[PDB]
């Protein structure tokens, strides 16, 4: 499968929540991982919502169709600076 | 496949975001490129959203059905002038 390129909800105010978003493939199962090694799956949703982001972080994904995974697709959720 | 002619969200205030929009083909996969040579794919979405446009720019597309690409379809996102 091709990569159903992942997005997010833009800059996240430090301390609040974020959403991740996979693109839509009609036959796909989705899986999100917290690590590039694709070993710690935290979500099977197409649009998983992350929580309490205090700094920049990355999530990964691997759209699977007919049992075959896509290439790893990383996404980042830029947290905004701190208002003094 | 025929060209699923691409659009956008109209003139973009200098410094803000824009959307791109492919037309809907029931069997199509979509791919957007940043270069006429169709070598630097940046999006697999039907409605990819671009970011921080400061001047006029172009994006391309190539609706693929049954593995066969359409002709290249360019689109432009006119950024509005600067308010003095």
Interface check A2 vs B, CB under 8 A: yes
Scan for tokens 């159903």, then name that residue.
A4
Q: In chain B, which residues have their Cβ closer than 8 Å to the Cβ of A5?
A: 43-45
Interface check B44 vs A, CB under 8 A: yes
Inspect the interface and report whether the beta carbons of A23 and B44 lie closer than 8 Å.
Answer: yes
CA distance B80 to chain A (A): 23
Q: What is the DSSP letter of A10?
A: S
Contacting residues for A67 by C-beta, under 8 A, at least 6 apart: none
Backbone φ and ψ of A55, nearest 5° = -155, 175
Backbone φ and ψ of B19, nearest 5° = -120, 150
How far lies A14's CA from each of A18, A52, A57, B52, in Å? 10, 8, 12, 21
Kindly tell me the sign of the dihedral angle through the C-alpha atoms of B82, B78, B22, A31: negative
Closest CA to B77 of B65, B61, B63, B59: B59
Question: Which structure tokens are listed for A4?
Answer: 């159903």
Task: Please report which residue ranges of A1-84 form alpha helices under DSSP H.
Answer: none
Q: What is the DSSP letter of A3?
A: -
Please tell me what resolution, in angstroms, this structure has: 3.4
Closest CA to A16 of A82, A61, A75, A60: A82
């Amino acid at each position: 499968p091709s990569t159903a390129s992942a997005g997010n909800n833009g800059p996240v105010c430090t301390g609040t929540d974020a959403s991740l978003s996979a693109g839509t493939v009609s036959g796909a199962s989705y899986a999100w991982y917290t690590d590039a090694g694709t070993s710690n799956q935290f979500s099977t949703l197409q649009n998983p919502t992350v929580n309490n982001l205090t700094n920049d972080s990355t999530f990964y994904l691997l759209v699977t169709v007919n049992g075959c995974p896509s290439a790893l697709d990383s996404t980042t959720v830029v947290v905004y600076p701190l208002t003094p």
